[model samples]
Target: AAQTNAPWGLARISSTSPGTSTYYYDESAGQGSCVYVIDTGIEASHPEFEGRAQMVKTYYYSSRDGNGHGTHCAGTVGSRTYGVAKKTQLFGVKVLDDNGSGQYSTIIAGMDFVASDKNNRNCPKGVVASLSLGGGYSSSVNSAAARLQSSGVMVAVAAGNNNADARNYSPASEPSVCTVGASDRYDRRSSFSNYGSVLDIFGPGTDILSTWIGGSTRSISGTSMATPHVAGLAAYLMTLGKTTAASACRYIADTANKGDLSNIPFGTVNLLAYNNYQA
Candidate 1:
């Protein structure tokens, strides 16, 4: 077996087949793009971020992430050591609370902020929002995601962890956002990953390692862990001129590693995300 300088998820994304132990990517892959992490707040002081991650807004009381979920996902998106996109800017849009729970209105409020901030900022490469949280169906949530896409923000959302059909969820079922499911290192659907036609692609999620609060690291699993990998890839694609959300999403689907996954439910595409990093 080969040794890896990167995490398993990162190593898996850059390889053409399973069992690869090393990760390879363009060192400049995600430069000039921005990714918004919509979850619990982020610990910006974490060394993995290297001053790239910042708190933009929070529906909760503060911009600090007591739960660590947001920090972990942000690390996967663009941490200096753990990320998919090595240079992408990361903004924490805190919607979930310390307990990792929030209402739809709170999440929608964060989305609204992302739209406004994106318009007001000079995002030279492009903008992407990574949502590592979702729940039951809500028309309002779906519409907000659609509006975010229309406003030129590439949105990547988690396809729930219920092991049920993703169609019953809100942003996951929404066509406007790229809904992602979870895959283990063996290229099998994670036991808890939501499935159905709503999923755009799969990502390495089980026992994923990333930055946590207090400048430490933790391993966890869920579609939440998988969403940022796609989001980071979308940011990388944006730097390569996939400027629009639709274009990035299309490329992610078209270039996905197909027919390599097992236990995917009917109607869900058997496609896993690839960053176009040739071995």
Candidate 2:
């Protein structure tokens, strides 16, 4: 048997994996920064988020998690056990439907909301956009994400799940995004993860346990599950005053854990993921 732990997500981000702790950067919970979970929706009132402050907005349907996907990703971004930055503020930007159907154009509209003057004024430190949803490749969405980056918002997007070239997908194919893939408990790329030149990094996305709707926590998996880890890490870096979007992206790419990932079929080149804490 292998030893694993809750808050392993946080551990991995802070360079405290395998339950090791030195307070290396425990205070880096992204205070003053915000991570936006752009997905189905968040159960803002869920118990794990009871005392947490959130800014929630939805583009389609109600401001609730008819599908628990968004709630789960949000939890991974800031909850006690599943988060990299536990006390960080969160913003729920819903762009997908309960059945998880969404258009790339719809996603751009949601991004528009996050970069809105109101949302900009709300978080003084900066913003991190977490996109766990993907559709057909859309140049408009790529341009929108790049536009958001120009506005000082860090964008982390899932690298699709077709186990093919990620460039064949939407947001993942978007060059300006901090494209993320999924790694398993052993730090290998997940079987279903899309790979290649577009992947910025891999995170613990396989069989992850995190908060869900109805004040509960559950296990889930996917490249979708891996996206929030990179998103949270981006916000954590922003909290430390490395304010520019360019700096944040460079830092993550430069310092992430890297490997050949030969265990994962189609994985031959070295890949990066949030690895250890820096400062």
Candidate 3:
């Protein structure tokens, strides 16, 4: 019960000391895993998603959320109170509309309708996706997140508040994705994110806060809010079994958090993400 409006970049991606006897704070968050959210849709009755949202896919018309930025990035990808998979499952894939705008083939037809599971949206065993929206480049939106990572899913994108690098946008330079970038709250690297090596990590996202779309809540920022805190810790590392997507995003980028930062543009040698993964 100590979400305390979560943050410390989702308590440094569900580990920030996954010690305290493997502390996950109440039966380890994110049950069975599921954190879709393509962007600009998802307010399934918000209440911080206690009912577990699920719009599935809505390329445009009304998947709900009138541009609250996909319910503020699906309440940090799992809001039981600004989450990191607080009891998971939250789908929504509208791909922006109602002025938030969208079009890269409507987000590659919303990641090929969640990797061709076409409307079933089961997502294999543990879906990850949390794009946070991007615009420029497109190789069918970078092969539709590598076809949802060969059907095991795990997207995580963003990296473009524009500060520059990040390979100049579009699924944030898509080298398979997991790009992120934005840090703050002392973790550094933010002044509008977008770093190099296609910047594969970094969270916090400056002024964060969560859920917003009539159910109300605010505080925004970008790297699209640090790509859903690494897509809700890769759906809490796929409920701890690391269900694919390159070993649950390589156990949060080999347990992120390397060094602080200096002034952006890759200054400090190791500005990874979560600066504390699994504590």
Candidate 4:
């Protein structure tokens, strides 16, 4: 069999099939929803994201997109012309620096900001947070995530890019968080995607093409890209009345397309299952 590329396409669950698109369009489009993206920071002006990104709040823990990691992730999650949630608002939180590293305290602080909204009345409603960075697991991080969940906010975290075990991490391992592992275009777990019972679901994260800083575009590899795909899905699910994080995850898992995994270690995750369910 031929090898499929990385970073597979991510479309709204409502837009999964042509028939579903017609049905959803006959009803209503997701016009007032939002998703919080906690990463390095988005470019905010990429063509695919222009007029599509809400950028309601920004907390800069890093200077800018030094290596363009945040921009890429943003494009995948919310870019208007390219992402899964083109109509959903994107709230960026820059916690990692150019070296793709940030202090745990910084990430926790960002999470707190989302949880509290800083008491700002202008905060957007139905917020779902996405995190693409992790360093195994920590109790403090888990506690923080639990608090966010209690606040009625859904959090999505990357299982990791090491392709090892999914049992480790601040968000992935957290019971309140939706842990996402990486898969290829074929819907098989990527060789580099970590796996375990903790992994909630899988998304395209192999070699994904998305926007970079300065309005550039490139193909990068990692489970990081996969994280946002699920994030967007979660947001869209919420728009469809699957409000809670657990419900959104169940929708994804119950609807994903379980592919052939006779040769893979972790088997296959049903990616199109959620899409089909909505259809």
How high is the CA lDDT of each candidate model?
0.89, 0.74, 0.72, 0.67
Model 4 misplaced regions, further than 4 Å? 1-7, 11-29, 54-63, 118-125, 259-273, 277-279
Task: Sort by TM-score, best first.
Answer: 1, 2, 4, 3
Give the winner by TM-score.
Answer: 1
For each candidate in turn, the TM-score is 0.97, 0.88, 0.33, 0.82
Residue pairs in clash, model 3: 15-278, 15-279, 16-278, 16-279, 17-278, 17-279, 18-278, 202-273, 257-275
Cα lDDT of candidate 2 equals 0.74
The sequence of per-residue lDDT tens digits that candidate 1 reaches over residues 1-279 is 222677889888878888876878766668889999999988999988989888989886798999989999999999877888978889998899999999999889889889899876667889999999988999999999988888889999999999999999989999978999999999999999999988989999998999999999999999999999999999988887754666788789898899999998778899999876654
Q: Candidate 2's error at 35, in angstroms?
A: 1.1
Candidate 2 residue pairs in clash (backbone atoms < 3 Å): 201-272
**What digit string (tens of lDDT, one per residue) describes model 2 on residues 1-279?**
111365555455555243442224547577777778888888888767656635467776587778899989999888866666666788887788888877777788888777773354466667788889887777888888878777778888898888888887887888777888887766667888888788877777888788888888898889888898888777777777764556676678777655534455454344545535556
lDDT per residue as tens, model 3, 1-279: 344435556654444432121213434566777778888888879788878887867866677888788888888878877776778888888878867888788788788787765336553447778887787776678788877776777888887887787676787788876778787666567797777876666777878878898899888888888888778777766676644666655566676756555575534234454423332
Q: Is candidate 1 or candidate 2 better by lDDT?
A: 1
Candidate 2 residue runs with Cα over 4 Å from true position: 1-4, 16-24, 53-55, 117-120, 264-269
List candidate 3 segments past 4 Å from native: 1-36, 39-51, 60-76, 79-83, 87-91, 94-103, 108-129, 132-156, 159-165, 171-226, 231-265, 268-279
The best-first sequence of candidates by lDDT reads 1, 2, 3, 4
How does candidate 4 score on lDDT?
A: 0.67
